């Protein structure tokens, strides 16, 4: 692929449950994509223009643990399945695509970078299909064009019989 990615974990359980409860995260925040957890689920946020964006089926209407206590959504749009918090200092903010490319790259929670064919405003097909369990936890993850700009964030897999062949996504125009 043309983009590479790696993860670095920042907390595990005890730190997780304790920080959701308290709402204060003193950790140093880095990188273009935040890995997120709540009690029940796991998902991604993509930093675009100073907003951390993720899927409403994952964050609900929750605050995001921050340096100075819990951070309030500044964007909450249930039908689009989109929410937005002002990104914490440290986040690497990315930029909206304008090249209109149809070669896209999905970045997953594991930092794989997998090729996607843009098919509509909000649909993209996996060039090589994957098991759906491999995309699990990756909602909110970025779809990249080949110069590394946001075309959208990952919403849901389209899957028959446990293999994922396409993906719905929230097109960055929505953000």
């Amino acid at each position: 692929a043309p983009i590479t990615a790696y993860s670095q974990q920042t907390r595990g359980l005890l730190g997780c449950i304790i920080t959701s409860l308290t709402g204060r995260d003193k950790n140093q925040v880095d990188g273009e994509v935040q890995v997120l957890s709540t009690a029940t689920q796991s998902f991604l946020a993509t930093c675009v223009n100073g907003v951390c964006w993720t899927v409403y089926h994952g964050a609900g209407s929750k605050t995001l643990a921050g340096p100075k206590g819990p951070i309030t959504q500044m964007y909450t749009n249930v039908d689009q399945d989109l929410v937005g918090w002002p990104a914490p200092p440290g986040a690497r903010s990315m930029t909206p695509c304008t090249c209109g490319s149809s070669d896209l790259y999905l970045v997953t929670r594991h930092a794989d970078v997998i090729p996607v064919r843009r098919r509509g405003d909000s649909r993209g097909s996996l060039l090589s299909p994957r098991p759906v369990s491999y995309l699990k936890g990756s909602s909110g993850g970025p779809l990249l064009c080949p110069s590394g700009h946001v075309v959208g964030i990952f919403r849901a897999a389209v899957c028959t019989r446990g293999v994922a062949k396409a993906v719905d996504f929230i097109p960055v125009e929505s953000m």
Partner: peptide
């Protein structure tokens, strides 16, 4: 109950 940054992905 607040969402928590449990890790991050660095882009290249």
């Amino acid at each position: 109950g607040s969402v928590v940054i449990v890790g991050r992905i660095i882009l290249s």
